Design a protein around this ligand. Sequence first.
Ligand SMILES: OCC1=C[C@H](N[C@H]2C[C@H](CO)[C@@H](O)[C@H](O)[C@H]2O)[C@H](O)[C@@H](O)[C@@H]1O
Ligand SMILES: OCC1=C[C@H](N[C@H]2C[C@H](CO)[C@@H](O)[C@H](O)[C@H]2O)[C@H](O)[C@@H](O)[C@@H]1O
Ligand SMILES: OCC1=C[C@H](N[C@H]2C[C@H](CO)[C@@H](O)[C@H](O)[C@H]2O)[C@H](O)[C@@H](O)[C@@H]1O
Ligand SMILES: [Ca+2]
Ligand SMILES: [Ca+2]
Ligand SMILES: [Ca+2]
Ligand SMILES: [Mg+2]
Ligand SMILES: [Mg+2]
Ligand SMILES: [Mg+2]
Lengths: 548, 548, 548
Amino acid sequence: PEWYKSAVFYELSVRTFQDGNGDGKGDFPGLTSRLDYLKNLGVDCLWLLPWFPSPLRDDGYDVADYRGIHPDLGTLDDFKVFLREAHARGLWVIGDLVTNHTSSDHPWFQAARRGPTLPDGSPNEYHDYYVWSDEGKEYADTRIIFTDTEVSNWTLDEQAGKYYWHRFFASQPDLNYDNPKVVEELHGAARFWLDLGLDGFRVDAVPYLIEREGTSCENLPETHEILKGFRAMVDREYPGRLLLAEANQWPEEVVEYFGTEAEPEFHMCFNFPVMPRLYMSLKREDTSSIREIMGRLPKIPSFGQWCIFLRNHDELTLEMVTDDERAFMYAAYAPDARMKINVGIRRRLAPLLDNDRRRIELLNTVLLALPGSPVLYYGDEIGMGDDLGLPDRNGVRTPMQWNAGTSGGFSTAQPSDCFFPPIQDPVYGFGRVNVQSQLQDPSSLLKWTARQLELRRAHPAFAHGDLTFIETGNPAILAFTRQYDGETLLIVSNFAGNAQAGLLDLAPFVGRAPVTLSGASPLPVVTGNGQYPVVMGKYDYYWLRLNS
Amino acid sequence: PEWYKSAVFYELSVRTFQDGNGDGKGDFPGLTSRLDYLKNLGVDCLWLLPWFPSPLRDDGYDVADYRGIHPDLGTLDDFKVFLREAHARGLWVIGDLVTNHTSSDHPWFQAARRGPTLPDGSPNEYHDYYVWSDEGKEYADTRIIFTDTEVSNWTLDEQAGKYYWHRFFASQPDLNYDNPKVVEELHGAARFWLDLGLDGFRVDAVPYLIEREGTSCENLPETHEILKGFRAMVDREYPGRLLLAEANQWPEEVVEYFGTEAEPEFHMCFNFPVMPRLYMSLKREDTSSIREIMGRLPKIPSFGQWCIFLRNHDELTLEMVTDDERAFMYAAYAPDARMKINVGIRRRLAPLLDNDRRRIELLNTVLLALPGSPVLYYGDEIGMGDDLGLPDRNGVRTPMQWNAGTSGGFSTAQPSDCFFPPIQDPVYGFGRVNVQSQLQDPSSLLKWTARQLELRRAHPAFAHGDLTFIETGNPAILAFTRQYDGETLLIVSNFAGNAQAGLLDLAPFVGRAPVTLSGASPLPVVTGNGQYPVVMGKYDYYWLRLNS
Amino acid sequence: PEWYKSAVFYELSVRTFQDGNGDGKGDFPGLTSRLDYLKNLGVDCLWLLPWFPSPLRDDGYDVADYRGIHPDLGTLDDFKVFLREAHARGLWVIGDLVTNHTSSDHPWFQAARRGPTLPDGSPNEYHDYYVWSDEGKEYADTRIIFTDTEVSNWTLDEQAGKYYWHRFFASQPDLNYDNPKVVEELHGAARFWLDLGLDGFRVDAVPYLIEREGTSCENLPETHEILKGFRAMVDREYPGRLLLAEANQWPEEVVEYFGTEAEPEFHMCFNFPVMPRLYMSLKREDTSSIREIMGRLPKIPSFGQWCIFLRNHDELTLEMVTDDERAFMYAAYAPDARMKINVGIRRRLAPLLDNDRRRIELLNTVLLALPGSPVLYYGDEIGMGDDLGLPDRNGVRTPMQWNAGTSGGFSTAQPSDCFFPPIQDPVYGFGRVNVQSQLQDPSSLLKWTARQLELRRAHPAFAHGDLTFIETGNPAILAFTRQYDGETLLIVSNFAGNAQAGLLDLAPFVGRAPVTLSGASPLPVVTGNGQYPVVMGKYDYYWLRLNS
Ligand SMILES: OCC1=C[C@H](N[C@H]2C[C@H](CO)[C@@H](O)[C@H](O)[C@H]2O)[C@H](O)[C@@H](O)[C@@H]1O
Ligand SMILES: OCC1=C[C@H](N[C@H]2C[C@H](CO)[C@@H](O)[C@H](O)[C@H]2O)[C@H](O)[C@@H](O)[C@@H]1O
Ligand SMILES: OCC1=C[C@H](N[C@H]2C[C@H](CO)[C@@H](O)[C@H](O)[C@H]2O)[C@H](O)[C@@H](O)[C@@H]1O
Ligand SMILES: [Ca+2]
Ligand SMILES: [Ca+2]
Ligand SMILES: [Ca+2]
Ligand SMILES: [Mg+2]
Ligand SMILES: [Mg+2]
Ligand SMILES: [Mg+2]
């Protein structure tokens, strides 16, 4: 099959990974010098956060030039060496294609805000690149996203004398997508990078492209047709390149972003629905929500693969959970006011699980065992924490912690001169949490993530098998099978903080002996009614092979 | 004497040595271009791993066709050139005869599985080719060999509706040697390759041919009979060709596989008894087990030679050691569960000795100075590592490392496209460990190996002399003599990491000076009671001649 | 006692150790980022090569500003940060003080060469800073040091129309120490850096300060007097700092550079006389030169410590050995013409010993076991090679090799943009020889060197003891004792490539039991008349204590 289903993804921010030149800002030269690290870890595809020239009011998601490299990050030549050194190691690389919007600093917008007509009486073709209103009464009662910052989705441009549309910050004007020229401007941005050998795109904020009155302005089939033709552009001109969608919607809406077999859209979507039910289930010690929402996912096209994740550069989103579930998650996972932002929790993985490695390893094994491809978030494989003294979501985007030398080894410059300060607290700082330390530590989390990704690699049912949940008799225990190519895997996990027991409904498998994927130690044969007793300790994960 | 008595052997796998044409698979044209390297190393006989057509579920030890060349390796023409060119260089070649079993894919088994009688009533002559049972309760309490994969030595064939026998994988059904038609299918399979000029065979899994109730199904007198008739055949139709047995059994059962003068069996068997004791002694700094298992070896026929070896394409086998011996070896040499498989340790020689050249050289000098003919495992002469992310025993069968270019010089294809990934880790990777490196390096393991073989060749007592152990007064120091044709070699070797003192019982040799084989530097003459005091540095090996 | 008697020194070159900003040149930010490496290695004092502003016609030993930081290396703030971080880790630092001469680009010399009298008829105070002759016929019959470049020690200045003196390159005019203003300018250079906290100075080319007619212009009493004044100044104004002298003279004249108890000079001098004899003896397999030269060295003052070294940033100097010894050394260690330069051999340690780790380990242990404090040349602890296609002695100054990524870890710039190109040959290139590789290799030369130093730390008789050579009966075996604080170390070393036997004269120690410093393994007790038989392997080092 396609390369993205066997892939392990790793999300990083070039400005934050390795500063190669002492100026305090990560760049492609330094990132290139770390490529062996990512290779040796068991990563396959690097997803890089936006690398474009930008005033960095949304850390690079306000693009001011789709066709350059931000000067903090080096040059386009540094980009081409990096992509060269990447593929030379067997790694794929995808970028972040910020389609929905541009920075107010983009040349397109500085021209649109002159007016609908120029001072020489000509039409201004750049004015209909964005969505304008005279009073700003359209689409009202539609959801604000950055609720802690923006009081509305319409803001008044003082020089253009009209309101303009923006689903995100005021300085990120929504692009107007009924205009087929804008459709062509981003087809030709996708082309500029796919020409240089880039292996695909993560596509940012796909649900909110088209806006239609009297609807929610999400998942409009008009938006889906823009994606349907983006896929056809790629299918024809750049076969084998990966399109991956950020679609945080409820399960039935999310699969629409794959398309159908006849009309394809995205190869991969992020599994935003299962992500919060992992954390809920851990605090409730009850895995029902994991099975419920996973059963609300319709089957995907042949070419589709889910992208599974635990965290990313954004807050932990609570936009697609019920009001009760959102209230529970604030109570369980956000004790301090400061950890809240925009209907979500802005904390790293390791802090959220109270730095419990037992819980960390648990959710990692479930990330690795659910159907799809996993994406690790840079630094989670060593246990990085966060700095909520930093505004917006930049509390999870601190520099990668390489050693206990200057600035954690991220730069030769001092921590106060780095773009974001490297974390230095007693628990998560780079004196305690860094790569070099965990390569010498025989038992480190880094070693453990590498070993576990090896354990996955060697069992292709993880990447391509089916899922069948299996009754356990205990809500704390979640059991499922993965079948593919006649290998059958049994993946039992305890979500509770003490010893739990269960009766697994292994009736399809009477006469088979489960044995461990690690060490090939055999468990007792399934017999009789197929009801198989287990005890598990707190947060244990049993990874098992059903030998027939 | 016989040619295999003076020979240095070298075990390689065609699929994995050298890829000629760029498709990622080693082949006979590639192997042919490397015969000069092998010649110059000091090697006399190549033993190749199974080259026959095969679905490769045991890396070609599941044979689908005894009279062909697997398409990966080229053609039978390519085979014929290879054997001409090897013979042109004074090299012998022996193949691998997989007698005990064939692949489920072999057209024999596809026929035998259609039942005891044909759809037209007539009896199916191929059915009695394999061993069957209606309930599969026979031969129980017989050892499983691949304990990590197979729950039983019987497996149900869904179409023939009965159980068949297999000492190894379920896709490797045993051949029925009670049926004398099977004995003749292998004689004629042997005849095929001997007719083409091949100089011999290593025979695979010879203890497990015949199975009988109430016995362990190992070293059965019936099995030996079949072997006796195999040597009687070869002795008659193909004098001078070589039969070498893989018989891992305890000292008293292994010597049986030579036969007697009156009734001969193999010319050579692998000296498995001493092999694990070499490693134990290094870890205990106690050379006792070596002398004890060597002492339990009864004298072998005139024509017979032991095949001495440190490692191979299989795990380090812990099947013929005591329970405490086995448990000690796991502790000392398998820190990870990953390192274990099937009552043994799946690791290359250099990793087993922590890449300590001083230890690597020591076991090699003992390999070269024990009585028999040494075999080198391919790549251990430049110190290759292993890859334990690869399943089964594949982790010691990664591609040979010729230089630091694309895929270590094994192929123009990417490492990802090689049949096994060429090792690229910072310690053993082909950037650090390769043949071009070590032909330039004046002191490399490669040149050391070539010189030690050169030194051995100069002293025929190494290949044909007797073995008298000598008292040292220090379990850490192993001392013995070799006596042949008037030469007396004295082989003192320290198995301890620190300096060690010893008093050697050279009472028989009072009046004679010991002198070094290398450099002709004499030690003090032996005098008086001939208790000869010696000091040794860590892992030191003294190769010495006793003057006359 | 004093800190430099217990210190392990480490010689590095900032421009060549670690580049912290991508410009291909090592700098102090970079060197700061590598301080934990040196700390963990067991290094105590960093001797940094000249770091001053200079046109680098002799790699910075032609100084053009004694009170600044060469812009390649960063700023004086960077230097202050480095000194703070070095001291924060218990590391001392010393600089290289180029006393005998400045660059012709030095402000003083641009001034001096204007003439004795300026355009306005008034005299030029800087003319008498340097050594001038009207026809250049003085001090005739005086050695030329840089014989492959310079034809005379007098050169005609174009503008001054006179001859100036230079024991070195013509772009390094000798300072004139009969002028007392000169003497004050270098007390003043000393004070500047000694005021920033620098712990001392390696003093360059100290024998050749004062020149006098009718002498060799070496080791003259007037030169020693200026050095006594330099010691007096530091003794009073900066107690506790280190003056270390580079004086390669014959054993008699070397010891003068310590001064007397009453009129002290240098705290330490390099033990140049012994350095070639270590190499002579390894090739002859006869250690009498080691003993003869060590015994021509008179006792040193109470404050004196020797500095022992195998190699450095220069050539292996053959200036102070006989004509026959020098011809031998050329035959043994300079097969190619390209390997000689000015009475000496310009190769790194590992190439000199054919990359034989047995011989590298032997001479390193003698380095650690002779009387003195040891200085390690950077990269020798990982086995770095040389690049003899670079001019002068730069072949041994190639960038440190850290990992196997871009430029070996030395810089993110490409190798072709690095000040000197990092080695990439198949034997010594950073793809085979680098720090990260050798941290993962359980048996690397780096770990060996670390552990051998730790062994040395544990036994103060190495730093502080006396030395008595011990008869052996075999010139290939060098045996001596180190006695201090009633601890008695016996050190035995074989300089030949085969086994060697000998009879240690241990009469002073009858009744004592020798044990290995590593492992505490006992040799037999000395009995009888203390004539102790020993056998050694090739290049063995027995490191023994005599248990009382
Ligand atoms: O509901 C999904 C989300 C989308 C949005 N994430 C993407 C779109 C935004 C475009 O400017 C950007 O801030 C964010 O980093 C992107 O990954 C939003 O910011 C998140 O808070 C939120 O969890
Ligand atoms: O008891 C000795 C052994 C025999 C077996 N080795 C041979 C039998 C198998 C036949 O299919 C084959 O996999 C293996 O490579 C052969 O050399 C076994 O696999 C080993 O693990 C083991 O050391
Ligand atoms: O006689 C000993 C030596 C001193 C000299 N070494 C120092 C003096 C030179 C001063 O310019 C300089 O080139 C060298 O690096 C210094 O360490 C000479 O250049 C060497 O070749 C030689 O080994
Ligand atoms: Ca939009
Ligand atoms: Ca059988
Ligand atoms: Ca002078
Ligand atoms: Mg930068
Ligand atoms: Mg091929
Ligand atoms: Mg620099």
